[model samples]
Target: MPPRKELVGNKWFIENYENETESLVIDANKDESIFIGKCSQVLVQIKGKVNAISLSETESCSVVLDSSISGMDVIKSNKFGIQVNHSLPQISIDKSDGGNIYLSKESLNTEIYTSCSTAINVNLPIGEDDDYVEFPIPEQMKHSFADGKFKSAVFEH
Candidate 1:
């Protein structure tokens, strides 16, 4: 697939990049948001801060971030990975599969929201720059009824 660019209502769209070696690089302003879709087996590098990003229908792609982004949204994707070297406030995942999020030391506090997703893992740096600990996002929960109320907790695999 060929990567296409479009500007729709102040948001940048990068679409249809599939199975390519050339990296897609971006230099964006803090006020701009980018939407990346239908990309596979490619590298996307962002130079600076951006308002937000949306990854949709992308597979086996790596997104490298040089600086902070307010938020990131992922939908209907598989085998996608993100390397965040700076602060990120939030991330949302819906109906996605097989994602990996590698966070920098400064971005450990980023909040994540996930629904209808599976096999999503998060890597947090430990000790040094190259060491990381992987944690999986729970896909199942245990629910029990007690005192006319239902209690739920994440299932341990």
Candidate 2:
């Protein structure tokens, strides 16, 4: 695919990135499969937005979704420690148990799947939907995520 931090098609990578390609603009209608390999402190400005693509594979990183992010049809997280610096860009997650979360203080309408576990940690607030967000865990350990009732904690950093 892309060399290493190059934008080939609708997908791109940033494994110890260089300046080959700095920014990416994705028109979801044209791009079918969007993906991001290994990111490091990347800034995601949703000038517009998804697919089945994601950024949870890397060992560690910080994905900042600025206020310019919106119109998110299917946003999710996979225990990637996603932190939203802005409080306006509403989003969702594939909820589960044992993982941590930080929702917006406003109408961020974030949704977590139902079949997920009950050990999740939702920061801002949680109602009936919850789940633990994880990493490298196999299928059996993976819960059926959705808008389900789960357990979690509320704390801010």
Candidate 3:
């Protein structure tokens, strides 16, 4: 199979899914925020301090970002990170450097978790808000998914 297209910019969406689990992994060391995943459909978006983002093994995942969006500054810090692994059944981030974001199966269900040195924020999915907030990794579960990387994991539904 061909490699999935890389997502970048402020606003974009992937609207295709064949009922397969998909995963989006991102590292925001390059000053860009990345958004990509497979829900009922495929969506992918990346912007602001994004070091790298990946969409793998699933039916759908889409990312969206808009540079014009106000208060939408991408997380600024060499420490921001993400990791997604399907085999592990969970995801994790590193906070020792600064702050990292991880989305797991529970996150999509409105169950969120986070850890940070500074004040951590949670953004719920409500009207007028198209994005979800990033959360910290639980200490116990951190090692469960930690393979020395930050990523997000999703099961194709």
Candidate with the greatest TM-score versus the true structure: 1
Worst 10 residues of 1 by lDDT: 1-10
lDDT for each residue of candidate 2 in 114-140, tens digit (9 for 90 to 100)? 233344444654344553233222223
Per-candidate TM equals 0.90, 0.39, 0.22
lDDT of the candidates, in the order given: 0.86, 0.38, 0.32
lDDT of 3 by residue, 131-156 (tens): 55554333332223467877565323
Of models 1 and 3, which has the larger TM-score?
1
Q: Could you tell me the TM-score of candidate 3?
A: 0.22
Name model 2 segments beyond 4 Å from true: 1-3, 16-34, 38-53, 67-79, 86-98, 114-119, 125-157
Model 2 misses residue 125 by how many Å?
6.8
Residue 58 shift from truth in candidate 2, angstroms: 2.8
TM-score, candidate 2, is: 0.39
Candidate 1 achieves a global lDDT of: 0.86
Model 1: per-residue lDDT, tens digit, 1-157? Answer: 5559777776888898878778888887788888889888988887789889889988988888855567898999888898898878988999988999999989988898999999999998974666999988989889999999999988896
Candidates 2 and 3 compared by TM-score, better number: 2
